[PDB]
Enzyme design. Structure first.
Site, PDB file in Angstrom:
ATOM      1  CE1 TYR A  26       0.942  -0.652   4.451  1.00 37.23           C
ATOM      2  CE2 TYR A  26       0.400   1.666   4.298  1.00 37.23           C
ATOM      3  CZ  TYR A  26       0.966   0.625   4.970  1.00 37.23           C
ATOM      4  OH  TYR A  26       1.556   0.901   6.171  1.00 37.23           O
ATOM      5  CG  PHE A  36       0.912   9.561   5.907  1.00 38.87           C
ATOM      6  CD1 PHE A  36      -0.012  10.037   4.995  1.00 38.87           C
ATOM      7  CD2 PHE A  36       0.600   8.431   6.631  1.00 38.87           C
ATOM      8  CE1 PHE A  36      -1.200   9.389   4.793  1.00 38.87           C
ATOM      9  CE2 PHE A  36      -0.596   7.781   6.435  1.00 38.87           C
ATOM     10  CZ  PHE A  36      -1.496   8.262   5.514  1.00 38.87           C
ATOM     11  CG  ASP A  37       1.496   5.716   4.821  1.00 41.26           C
ATOM     12  OD1 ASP A  37       1.340   6.761   4.158  1.00 41.26           O
ATOM     13  OD2 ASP A  37       0.605   4.856   4.965  1.00 41.26           O
ATOM     14  CB  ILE A  56      -7.729   3.110  11.860  1.00 44.53           C
ATOM     15  CG1 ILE A  56      -7.110   3.456  10.498  1.00 44.53           C
ATOM     16  CG2 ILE A  56      -6.867   3.664  12.968  1.00 44.53           C
ATOM     17  CD1 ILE A  56      -7.456   4.823  10.026  1.00 44.53           C
ATOM     18  CE1 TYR A  82      -2.682   6.571  14.374  1.00 40.59           C
ATOM     19  CE2 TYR A  82      -3.887   5.637  12.539  1.00 40.59           C
ATOM     20  CZ  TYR A  82      -2.858   5.577  13.443  1.00 40.59           C
ATOM     21  OH  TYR A  82      -1.985   4.523  13.406  1.00 40.59           O
ATOM     22  CG  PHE A  99      -4.643   4.424   3.097  1.00 44.03           C
ATOM     23  CD1 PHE A  99      -3.510   3.842   3.626  1.00 44.03           C
ATOM     24  CD2 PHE A  99      -5.371   5.301   3.879  1.00 44.03           C
ATOM     25  CE1 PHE A  99      -3.102   4.142   4.901  1.00 44.03           C
ATOM     26  CE2 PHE A  99      -4.967   5.608   5.150  1.00 44.03           C
ATOM     27  CZ  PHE A  99      -3.831   5.028   5.666  1.00 44.03           C
TER      28      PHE A  99
END
Lengths: 107, 132, 843
Positions: A26, A36-37, A56, A82, A99
């Site tokens: 992902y 961020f990832d 989450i 979050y 995502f």
């Protein structure tokens, strides 16, 4: 609240069912922001399972409404996600998340 | 032209009266031709200094920088001096001389003629410091 | 606030040399059809989402400058207003990618195709997913330029277009009344791929850096004739002119074998006009009369002085010899005058060429313009075709000759190339070698490191160069030195900081000046070290080598190898970065050292806010082009928060400066040209409960109001730069989802609005937003004085001007990359890392 917008290769039939280890390669993204990832850089496509409250529940509800081989762009509401204070130092509050996802699910 | 034309420069070294001889003939016609003759010669005559481009003759000409005479030059050829450093000897000197070496200088006679030309260049640099 | 990073694949694009637009005249049917076939297996590379999209571009995209752009990376296409893009659910322009619906919402899979239906009448563009229609279009956009076949693409993709001409294996029909390459496609050329802004190519031996190219007739795609009182002596001699040309086409008729009979027929190959100029039929008499007159009507507008000059060549008229094989059944013998001796000059043959271009242009007027002959045509006579040009020229070349036998005597910028500063050289004896491919404008030498761009090379103290285009040198202007170049022409370039000298060499020999001085730039001060440099005008090529290896030097056997002068990149394991010159006009802050543009941080008093007043040397200094001035702080709207932009001069004005309702980080800015006055200022003010910018002024029209982050046009006009609009639709085109988007300069033309003729002061009042005050502008960018409702002006704020050009860096590496519709390859990957400012929003 979760709303999927799928690019549909793959079978489109085999949903990830409960008691199963879904494996997505992902990458995230923020609402008019930047990344961020990413599992792609780290070369560990995130071997986790469903119904366990590990991730989450926005990501889980996205994981429920998908299949094998498909590709979706998963919006994420902050109260689902979050965002009331956010992951501190990494995410501010009221974070509406995005995502990219690509997966096999060996159950 | 590498073997010769340097005795002309040696005659041009002494005999300032010859510098006067140039003047009457020139104004009959001063950065004279006389000093300015060997410029292309100084370009192309010292191609095969030593190993074509090696310039151990550079250090040799450093040895000859005393207005050294011909017997002194022969003695210094008897002495000998060279280097093979990994500095800029490589590309300019060795890696263009030995590729440039169609027939590489392999004798003490070649170094003898090379350091003779080095003493010639020492006299020429003395004359050039006279011009500038 | 801070410096983020990630890795991005090197974005790229390509273009077949096909150029289509609109002008008042010739258009070549303006409606063309696309076919493409893909074969890739790489929706995701190693790194990121692989990239492919398609659209058009009006010769001002220039997104290839591979590096950074307004988004993250100098990305492909649909990343501006002067180009468009699409990859399945999209309307790409300016890193704005709002999607659309279509059957089968899936993106660019392999073994997929597309077409592009270009309309220009009501100018609208859609595409077509492989066989099915797209329910979303572009429309209501500008046309000052030619609209290209373009695909932007990332690594590891193979693809092929298909043309229509020779091997265009069209699965798919064209859209209604559309053209696959029949009428005039490369009418004086052939077909080839031509990636835009390609300032480098992979060379045979060393890579051939190149300069720009002239805009290939965006306007001037239409030709033009010359638009009257004939003297009576010309009216007299017209009969003799008509008779001589009639004899001449009788010759060219019968040389084929076209003798005379009174009937027109093909097998006996007659042509019933083969009679005298008076025996011809009356409409055909008027026809040949009109040609014999209209040659003179073309000749009258030349500043001539015509008349029967001598009457000494008239009796000297000698008729050439023609045997009886050229006598024919007419009895009207072709009997042309003999003009072996009648030579006018080399010059006014070009006048005949001008008459030929006017002939082709009146052909255009007759057939294409008013006629619009729906069948197989010609093209603009400036570049229509060499063959018809020379034919139409030599047809009328004999008319002026026949007259003289009758005694009627008659009569956008430069690219600049430099190494970086780390390789700057201070001492020793150094050499590099440039090679000249072309022999147009280009300049080479050594130069100081701080070469300001936006100035010609050698126009100041910072350079010492040679210009062998003309056999000149150049130092604070041209000076004469050395012979010029021809093609090929290895130029060596040398320097010796030990003695303050300069040495150019030209294919293995030292150049000389008029004084016989050995390349005189003497007593050059040392300064900040030195740096080699090159440049190139439009349509110019030449590579070089820095002595990265000594064998690659073409000559290097004359002047340095025995003489101390050194290869530049001798003891390296890598080349230089080779910084280069930009074309896009990025903003940059005010240098305080400027001649005639000076600012003042006006401190706010009790009865006034702070302000920023400009000052200009209202003198013989440059009151130059309209300099768009911008501020530092941005303003992304939430997600709205105004629901519009609205302006007030001193009261409610032309409203609906465009609402958007997304981030849209804007900047206040304004047009401004000098009136030889102080100059319009920039204040910061709350109205009473809502921020109002107030640009105080006295002088004249200077068109202020807000402009976006992506604003980058140079000059030529304060208005008419924005063009792009949403065209989203549904299955029956029922989607009522549109908005006039792309407010690059969503601002006030202002010159029509107030003040027909006067000189009082003038103010303006845009809208800020409305918040809990129960106000300023400054509060809503620094986000700490947000609740603080007073107006401020912190030192982070520094106003700007777009320069036209700054510098930028060449990557040290580049991509790798062809028949059956000119296929193209890409297998190897590439990427970099990138910074990006959020306040500016550029990479």
């Amino acid at each position: 609240g979760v709303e999927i917008e799928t690019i549909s290769p793959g079978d489109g039939r085999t949903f990830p069912k409960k008691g199963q280890t879904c494996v997505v390669h992902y990458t995230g993204m923020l609402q008019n922001g930047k990344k961020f990832d990413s599992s792609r850089d780290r070369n560990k496509p995130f071997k986790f399972r469903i119904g366990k409250q590990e991730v989450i529940k926005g990501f889980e509800e996205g994981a429920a409404q998908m299949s094998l081989g498909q590709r979706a762009k998963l919006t994420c509401t902050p109260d689902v996600a979050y965002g009331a204070t956010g992951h501190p130092g990494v995410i501010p509050p009221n974070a509406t998340l995005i995502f990219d996802v690509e997966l096999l699910n060996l159950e | 032209e590498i073997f010769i034309y340097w005795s002309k420069s040696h005659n041009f070294k002494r005999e300032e009266q010859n510098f006067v001889v140039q003047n009457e003939i020139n104004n009959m016609s001063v950065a004279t031709l006389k000093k300015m003759l060997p410029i292309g010669l100084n370009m192309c005559a010292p191609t095969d200094q030593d190993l074509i481009m090696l310039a151990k003759t550079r250090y040799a000409l450093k040895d000859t920088d005393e207005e050294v005479r011909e017997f002194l030059q022969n003695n210094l050829h008897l002495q000998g001096k060279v280097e093979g450093s990994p500095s800029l000897r490589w590309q300019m000197a060795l890696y263009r001389g030995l590729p440039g070496r169609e027939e590489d200088a392999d004798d003490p006679e070649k170094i003898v003629r090379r350091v003779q030309e080095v003493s010639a260049v020492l006299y020429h640099l003395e004359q050039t410091e006279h011009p500038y | 606030l801070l410096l983020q990073t990630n890795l991005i694949n090197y974005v790229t694009s390509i273009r077949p040399n096909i150029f289509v637009g609109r002008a008042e005249g010739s258009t070549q049917y303006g409606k063309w059809y696309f076919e493409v076939m893909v074969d890739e297996v790489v929706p995701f590379l190693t790194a990121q989402a692989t990239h492919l999209r398609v659209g058009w571009a009006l010769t001002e995209g220039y997104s290839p400058y591979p590096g950074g752009g307004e988004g993250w990376g100098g990305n492909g296409v649909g990343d501006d207003l002067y180009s468009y893009g699409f990859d399945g659910l999209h309307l790409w322009t300016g890193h704005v990618a709002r999607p659309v619906t279509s059957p089968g919402q899936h993106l660019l899979a392999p073994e997929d195709v597309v077409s592009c239906c270009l309309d220009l009448s009501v100018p609208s563009i859609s595409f077509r997913i492989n066989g099915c229609p797209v329910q979303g279009v572009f429309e209501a956009f500008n046309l000052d330029g030619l609209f290209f076949p373009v695909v932007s693409f990332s690594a590891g993709v193979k693809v092929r277009f298909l043309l229509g001409g020779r091997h265009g294996e069209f699965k798919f029909l064209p859209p209604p009344g559309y053209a696959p390459c029949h009428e005039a496609v490369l009418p004086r050329e052939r077909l080839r791929l031509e990636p835009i802004k390609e300032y480098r190519r992979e060379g045979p031996r060393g890579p051939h850096l190149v300069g720009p190219s002239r805009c290939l007739s965006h306007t001037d795609f239409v030709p033009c004739p010359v638009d009257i009182v004939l003297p009576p002596h010309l009216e007299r001699i017209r009969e003799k002119l008509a008779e001589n040309i009639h004899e001449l086409w009788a010759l060219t008729r019968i040389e084929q074998g076209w003798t005379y009979g009174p009937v027109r027929d093909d097998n006996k190959r007659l042509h019933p006009c083969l009679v005298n100029f008076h025996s011809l039929p009356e409409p055909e008499r008027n026809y040949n009369l009109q040609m014999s007159g209209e040659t003179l009507k073309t000749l009258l507008a030349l500043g001539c002085h015509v008349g029967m000059a001598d009457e000494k060549a008239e009796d000297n008229l000698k008729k050439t010899k023609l045997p009886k094989t050229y006598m024919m059944s007419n009895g009207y013998k072709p009997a042309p005058l003999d003009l072996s001796h009648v030579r006018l000059t080399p010059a006014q043959t070009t006048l005949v060429d001008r008459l030929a271009e006017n002939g082709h242009n009146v052909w255009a007027r007759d057939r294409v313009a008013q006629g619009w002959s729906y069948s197989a045509r010609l093209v603009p006579y400036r570049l229509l075709d060499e063959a018809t040009k020379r034919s139409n020229r030599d047809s009328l070349c004999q008319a002026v000759r026949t007259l003289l036998g009758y005694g009627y005597n008659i009569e956008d910028r430069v690219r600049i190339f430099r190494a970086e500063k780390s390789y700057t050289v201070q001492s020793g004896r150094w050499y590099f070698e440039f090679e000249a491919v072309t022999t147009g404008e280009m300049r080479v030498g050594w130069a100081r490191p701080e070469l300001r761009p936006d100035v010609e090379l050698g126009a100041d103290e910072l350079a010492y160069v040679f210009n062998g285009h003309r056999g000149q040198r150049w130092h604070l202007g041209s000076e004469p030195f050395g012979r010029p170049w021809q093609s090929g022409d290895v130029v060596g370039c040398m320097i010796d900081l030990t003695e303050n000298t300069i040495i150019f060499t030209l294919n293995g020999e030292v150049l000389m000046s008029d004084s016989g001085s050995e390349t005189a730039f003497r007593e050059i001060e040392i300064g900040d070290g030195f740096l080699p440099v090159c440049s190139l005008g439009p349509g110019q090529v030449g590579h070089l080598n820095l002595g990265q290896d000594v064998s690659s030097l073409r000559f290097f056997a004359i002047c340095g190898l025995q003489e101390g002068f050194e290869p530049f990149a001798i003891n390296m394991q890598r080349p230089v970065t080779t910084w280069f010159s930009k074309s896009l006009p990025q903003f940059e802050p005010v240098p305080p050292e400027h001649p005639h543009y000076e600012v003042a941080r006006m401190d706010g008093t009790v009865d006034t806010p702070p302000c920023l007043r400009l000052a200009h040397r209202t003198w013989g200094s440059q009151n130059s082009l309209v300099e768009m001035l911008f501020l530092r702080l941005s303003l992304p709207v939430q997600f709205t928060t105004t629901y519009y932009y609205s302006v007030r001069v001193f009261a409610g004005q032309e409203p609906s400066c465009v609402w958007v309702g997304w981030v849209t980080p804007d900047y206040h800015q304004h047009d401004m040209n000098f009136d030889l006055s102080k100059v319009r200022a920039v204040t910061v003010t709350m109205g009473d409960e809502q921020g109002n910018v107030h640009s105080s002024l006295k002088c004249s029209n200077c068109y202020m109001v807000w402009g976006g982050d992506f604003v980058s046009p140079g000059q030529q006009g304060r208005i008419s730069h924005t063009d792009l609009v949403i065209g989203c639709l549904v299955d029956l085109a029922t989607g009522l989802m549109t908005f006039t988007a792309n407010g690059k300069e969503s601002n006030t033309f202002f010159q029509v609005e107030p003040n027909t003729k006067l000189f009082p002061a003038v103010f303006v009042l845009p809208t800020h937003q409305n918040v809990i005050q129960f106000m300023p502008l400054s509060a809503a960018m620094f986000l700490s004085e947000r609740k603080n409702p007073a107006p401020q002006c912190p030192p982070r704020l520094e106003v700007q001007m777009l320069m036209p050009v700054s510098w930028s860096r060449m990557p040290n590496h580049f991509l790798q990359v062809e028949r059956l519709g000119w296929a193209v390859q890409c297998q190897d990957p590439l990427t970099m890392m990138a910074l990006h400012i959020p306040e500016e929003n550029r990479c």
